[PDB]
């Protein structure tokens, strides 16, 4: 697994935009288009 492979320098850096921010962007787009 991705979290189970952190043994040989395998670092999975976090995404810059959190899922909450993406959800907020989608909600803003939906409100704007509506």
């Amino acid at each position: 697994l991705i979290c189970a492979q952190k043994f040989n320098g395998l670092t999975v850096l976090p995404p810059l935009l959190t899922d909450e921010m993406i959800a907020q962007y989608t909600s803003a787009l939906l409100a704007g288009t509506i």
Binding site: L1, I2, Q5, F7, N8, L10
Partner: protein, 49 residues
């Protein structure tokens, strides 16, 4: 409403993302497993040699 059902009753709707995740996981697993190959050497452990 149908859209929800179209996803509720079907597990293959997210085929693309699942395939991408599976490909990445398989690549990482193969890379990790490659460390346990002798490659013609006596052993695959640095301390052993």
């Amino acid at each position: 409403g149908k859209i929800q059902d179209s996803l509720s009753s079907t597990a293959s709707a997210l085929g693309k993302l699942q395939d991408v995740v599976n490909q990445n996981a398989q690549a990482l697993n193969t890379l990790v497993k490659q460390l346990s190959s002798n490659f013609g050497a006596i052993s695959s452990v640095l301390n052993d040699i």
